[model samples]
Target chain A: KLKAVHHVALIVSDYDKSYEFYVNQLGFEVIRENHRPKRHDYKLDLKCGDIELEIFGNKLTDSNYCAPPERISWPREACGLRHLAFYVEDVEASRQELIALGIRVEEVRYDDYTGKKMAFFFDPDGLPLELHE
Target chain B: KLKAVHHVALIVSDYDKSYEFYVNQLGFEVIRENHRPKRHDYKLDLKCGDIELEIFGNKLTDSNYCAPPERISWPREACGLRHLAFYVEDVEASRQELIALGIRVEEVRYDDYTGKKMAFFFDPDGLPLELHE
Candidate 1:
């Protein structure tokens, strides 16, 4: 039996910008961090409400290390963590709030199936983010 | 600063078998299910300890409900939730445990950098899963 997903891990190119986008632009709280004994990398735990994210950067001077080729294939513009979808009562209002925060939001679309409205935006790393009602 | 990841959502090709693998083999619990009025589909929420997963079935009978062009391109073998790594105290012990359950486990490997052990495997849909110490 599958239990629950503990967290989603994302390898970031730049930690500072990504951290700013997530902590400042979006609203995520810090969980904890793990410092690797041998690497220059730092593990930062973050959460937007309940979603858990682990962002890892290569601190170990070894550029030779890599994830399976497939994991590395998500073109910076393609889809890996695509966009995370969170629910809100008002799609337009939330979109406006995000826009006002200087975050780039895409056009709104309706989900006739669920009677929900949706839209998208991005994080500093171009990680797609979504909002819905 | 980051909070915690509540869960990761994954799109799978099959439902029945996937349900069996995760719920029966991996050790996950069902959170709930939603039935759509217009679609023949079902939405299932599952949990493994604190991790959650949202699995949606396009039961509405619309094979044409295409995602963004980029999403429809994961090749069923590439990136997108590359194997999920779970923390286990003993990599070899867990490997033997999983093998006993008939789950495939890759050869045990040790990380020279972190001195941690790791290995990989797959879900019913071929989604990768990992074990680490």
Candidate 2:
């Protein structure tokens, strides 16, 4: 009953640093940053060509939705939004580049069932990023 | 520096129903529903033509990042993550269809700057949905 990923909405602590980390260190390009200060939020759209990632940042509020239950495990939850995977052309090259950039790109693993090889990593915010070939 | 919105990842309360609503009534085409029993989570890719929405549902956990400050006041923040707007060709028509399907469609408004008309609403899980003309 699902189609595909539209975009992931992340609430960041700091907007500027997150933006630079995503666009400069990583390969994502900035699509737009909607500065709606009166609305108390700034939306930054980052993308690698067609793929986009959104960051929504502001101050903290009281009635925010509860965090996902899966996150309690601290990287051990085997359920719920595990991570965001980006499909790329070259897994090895991307891994090396990201590692050289000081981003942790885990060892690549091949999926025998899907016939795809993928490497896992994390964003500046500790969000998961995976590249599959 | 941004290309476009690739997809949005949502932390859902119930995956089964959200899947049915998005794919069946919302006009999203189910691209792939990956159920990795080992991972104990499910990943769904829903698409309307090239647009996609990804839903990640599991349990909640601690060590999760703090909530965005904008979600305070039960809906009166003005700083972080407002709503995920889905661009539609015909806001009025889509509103009617969604309403008929038992979804709430707020009144439509026109934007002079972007030359677009749009409406606002929410998913069953309370995630915001917008349609732009």
Candidate 3:
């Protein structure tokens, strides 16, 4: 059986912007970083609870790290795998922290199913990352 | 900032097929299961190592869970959040178990940077799930 999530990767467009968003604003601890010559990208690995968050500055480095027009819609984002959400102690408190950090967060509300407090914030590239408490 | 991943959602097209694959074949313990009439969806919450694996049969209980043509390509899957990989004790052993269970797995190899053994397996909807050791 699978033990735990090893990592979840996000493809980032601008290296500096993502670096700042995750490392500086969100305060994710950096595990390691590398610049791949062939890919012309910087891959930064961050420490996620019980897993690793690997952001690929794949194409930043990106001209291709964005979701295509078809994959850009809403809940109908035609999916296989979708949004990445994180658990927080208090949703409203964390939401405010992000707003103070210049990160726009959605209104805190209950989940459709769980009814737990939750809100979403976008990465530098508009990837919806959720905070649930 | 973010404590840990709360959940990773996969929108599966066929409810029975996904249930067979994840719940039966993969052995991810079921946390909760429900059918949403409004969404005409079967929302399954699974217990991942330190997080929840929420597979939304958003449409099967799905006529809409498959990815669009634009997101079907390769490494250039034009991204925001990409693959979800799980950590295992032994990559080869886990790979064999999956093979024995009738799930197709990719050749085991080294990650480009870490050089750790890794392999990929697909869910019923062709979502790439990785096994790393």
Q: On a 0 to 1 DockQ scale, where is model 3?
A: 0.64
Better of 1 and 2 by DockQ: 1
Q: Which one wins on lDDT?
A: 3
Off by over 4 Å in 2: A1-9, A50-53, A58-83, A111-113, B1-11, B51-84, B109-115
Relative to the true structure, candidate 3 has a C-alpha RMSD (angstroms) of 3.0
Off by over 4 Å in 3: A59-71, B59-70
Real contacts recovered, all predictions: 0.22, 0.11, 0.74
The global C-alpha lDDT for each of the candidates, from Candidate 1 onward, is 0.58, 0.58, 0.80
Per-residue lDDT of candidate 1, residues A52-81 (tens digit): 566765432445433322332232222223
Model 1: per-residue Cα lDDT over B5-122, one tens digit each = 4345555445565667667777667777776643524556776565456665433245543221233223232323333566677789878888998999999998544678877877
Tell me the DockQ of each model, to 2 decimals: 0.21, 0.15, 0.64
Which rank order by DockQ, best down to worst?
3, 1, 2
The lowest-lDDT stretch of 10 consecutive residues in candidate 2 chain A is A64-73
What's model 1's lDDT at B73?
A: 23
Error (Å) of candidate 1 at residue B98 is 1.9
Return the TM-score for candidate 2, rounded to 2 decimals: 0.68
Q: What TM-score does each prediction get for chain A alone?
A: 0.72, 0.74, 0.86
Candidate 1 local lDDT, residue B85: 65
Which order, best to worst by TM-score? 3, 2, 1
State the lDDT of candidate 2 residue by residue for A1-133, as single tens digits.
Answer: 1223334455555566667677788757677877666443567777654434567664334233222111222434322233555667788888888888788888999853367887778755566666766
